[PDB]
Amino acid sequence: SCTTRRFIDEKEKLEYSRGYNQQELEASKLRKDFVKKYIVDFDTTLYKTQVERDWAYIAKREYRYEVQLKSIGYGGALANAVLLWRIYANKKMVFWPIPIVGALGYLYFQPVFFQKSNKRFFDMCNVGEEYYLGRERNKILRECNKILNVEDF
Amino acid sequence: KLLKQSIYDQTTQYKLIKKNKKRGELIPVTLARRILRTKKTLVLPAHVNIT
């Protein structure tokens, strides 16, 4: 729902604002590695069952809009700022700040937006213990529960 | 959702709602029914066919 999505977004913003501890950082690293590999580094249409393919593609689309597109937008904003600076300095149109600074901004902001929304992507893979993706996510979840001394879903 | 015993005067509550009830510009049709009120409801099932 819109309320659920807004609550998730704002809670993630608050969590990123306050900090991320040490064991929380370790659990976040495990979750990010699993999500990155099994979603970004894999073709989600290659899973055996239809449930796995559908929900892995949903998670990948969420990653695309919340990390890839957001990081592209923020890197483009940084590139636009540098581009305006260089146009004002040189008193002429320049093209170098677009590619280089855009790539630097993307590389700066992709880890930030991935760390912010790691739990969101990790939980969206909870298709169940009957499937390979769900089994792998549950293994990583049990490791994270051991690290954080809590129980998650 | 409990049919409790009222400590008020139900006639007075009815007459105060009738006389002067708070309203506003953006008031929903659910809470503002003046011409759409009846004493009976036609109850039908859902997801099925009625002639």
Binding site: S1, C2, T3, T4, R6 | -
Partner: protein
């Protein structure tokens, strides 16, 4: 007046309504998978009809 306002105002309005007002949802509902969706704005108010 002719082009920019008549082709972007309603989209901006719907985006702001979803972004800020949560599409006017009555939040006291139990199960999202069993609840109807409060649709974003779909009737254009910048067209005469």
């Amino acid at each position: 007046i002719v082009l920019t306002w008549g082709w972007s105002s309603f989209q901006i309005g719907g985006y702001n309504y979803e972004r800020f007002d949560d599409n006017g949802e009555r939040r006291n509902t139990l199960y999202w998978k069993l609840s109807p969706v409060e649709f974003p704005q779909s009737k254009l108010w910048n067209r005469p009809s």
